[PDB]
């Protein structure tokens, strides 16, 4: 598809079996998701932004399903207000801006 | 152009004569940009990222070009930890996203 940017780049995400919306974020380096339990070990990060930083566990080798394509790689878990989806998976999918 | 995801997609722009780097963040409604002064008057908006809200200096009407493209329009002034192009400038340059 060819998304406009009019509105909020909200897509339908699949991740640990659950359907989210998700926003297509050129701006976040790694794909960050809102409280939930993921399978495997995990460690902790800290990432930055506006308003400052907050602490996520990060999972490594996480499938996500974005807007039915599948993608593999570090998904970041913690409290942040809306998914993200980011550019360590955005590039898997193919996603480029144009102008 | 076409940019790929692979790296930050920063780019260079110009405001008030000066050479900034920004962020094309499709992650972001609004254009915010680290302290500097702009001509005419401001408002006060208060905006929230990953690690809650800040308060910015909103100018409105701000001439702009972004990557050789013009734009005029809103601009935040304030603490953020890099310059962000947000949806409301990526639009007037013709900006979409596709995969
Ligand atoms: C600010 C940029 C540089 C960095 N972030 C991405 C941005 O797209 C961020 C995404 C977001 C939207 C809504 C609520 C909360 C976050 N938008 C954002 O702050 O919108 C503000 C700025 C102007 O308009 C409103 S991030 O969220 O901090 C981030 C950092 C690291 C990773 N790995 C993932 C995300």
Redesign the interface.
Same mark, same amino acid.
Do not use: C, M, Y
């Given at each position: #598809?060819?998304?406009? @940017?009019?509105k909020? #780049?909200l897509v339908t995400i699949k991740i640990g079996g659950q359907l989210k919306e998700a @926003?297509?974020?050129?701006?976040?380096?790694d794909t960050?998701i809102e409280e939930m339990s993921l399978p495997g070990r995990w460690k902790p990060k800290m990432?930055?932004?506006?308003?400052? =930083?907050?602490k996520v566990r990060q999972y490594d080798q996480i499938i996500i399903e974005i807007?039915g394509?599948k993608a593999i790689g570090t998904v970041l878990v913690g409290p942040? #207000?809306?998914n993200?989806i980011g550019?360590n998976l @955005?590039?898997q999918?193919?996603?480029?801006?144009? =102008?």
């Open positions: #598809p060819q998304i406009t @940017l009019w909020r #780049p @926003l297509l974020d050129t701006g976040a380096d960050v990432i930055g932004g506006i308003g400052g =930083f907050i807007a394509h942040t #207000p809306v993200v550019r @955005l590039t999918i193919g996603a480029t801006l144009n =102008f």
